[PDB]
Design a protein around this ligand. Sequence first.
Ligand SMILES: CCN[C@H]1CO[C@@H]2OCC[C@H](OC(=O)N[C@@H](Cc3ccccc3)[C@H](O)CN(CC(C)C)S(=O)(=O)c3ccc(OC)cc3)[C@@H]21
Ligand SMILES: [Cl-]
Ligand SMILES: [Cl-]
Ligand SMILES: [Cl-]
Ligand code: NA
Lengths: 99, 99
Amino acid sequence: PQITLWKRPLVTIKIGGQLKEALLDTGADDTVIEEMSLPGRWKPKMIGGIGGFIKVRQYDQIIIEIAGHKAIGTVLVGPTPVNIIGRNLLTQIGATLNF
Amino acid sequence: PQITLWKRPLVTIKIGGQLKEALLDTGADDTVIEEMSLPGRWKPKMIGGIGGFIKVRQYDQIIIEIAGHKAIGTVLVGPTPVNIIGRNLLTQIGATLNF
Ligand SMILES: CCN[C@H]1CO[C@@H]2OCC[C@H](OC(=O)N[C@@H](Cc3ccccc3)[C@H](O)CN(CC(C)C)S(=O)(=O)c3ccc(OC)cc3)[C@@H]21
Ligand SMILES: [Cl-]
Ligand SMILES: [Cl-]
Ligand SMILES: [Cl-]
Ligand code: NA
């Protein structure tokens, strides 16, 4: 699809067996999801943005379905105010910015 | 252009006659730039990001060139970690996300 940017580019995702709304975010290096449980190993990480840093759990090799497209990669889990799909998974679904 | 997301989608912008680097950010509603001098009056605005809220200065109807495309609109100035081009100006340059 082609998503215009008049409105937030929100899509439905499936992660950890749950459906969630997430923002397709080209200004995010990494994917960050609100608190939830994921299977396997994780390690702590700090990530920063406007407002400063938050502590997150880093899970690697997680499958996510993004608007119907399956991708695998690292997912950060922590107290983010919005679920964000960052470049590490946007690349896997072939997303590009065009103008 | 068609911009992939394997690296940060950084572009050159021109504002106040200065060249700067900025991030095309579909996750940002608004454009936020690091501290600089802009003409005219400003208005207060509180913006929230991943680590919390910051106060910024809101300047309206500012001329800004973005990867060679002319835009005129609102620019927020404040302690952002990186210059961010948000949806308010990505729509002015015709940008869309595609996959
Ligand atoms: C209330 C919403 N206002 C937000 C919405 O737009 C507003 O205007 C612009 C400034 C602020 O927007 C954001 O902070 N946008 C966030 C994504 C984001 C969206 C919503 C809430 C929080 C974050 C960005 O798209 C991605 N951010 C990075 C950029 C600030 C460089 S980030 O979420 O902090 C980030 C993500 C992954 C990551 O891995 C290393 C590291 C950092 C305001
Ligand atoms: Cl990854
Ligand atoms: Cl590619
Ligand atoms: Cl505007
Ligand atoms: Na894992």
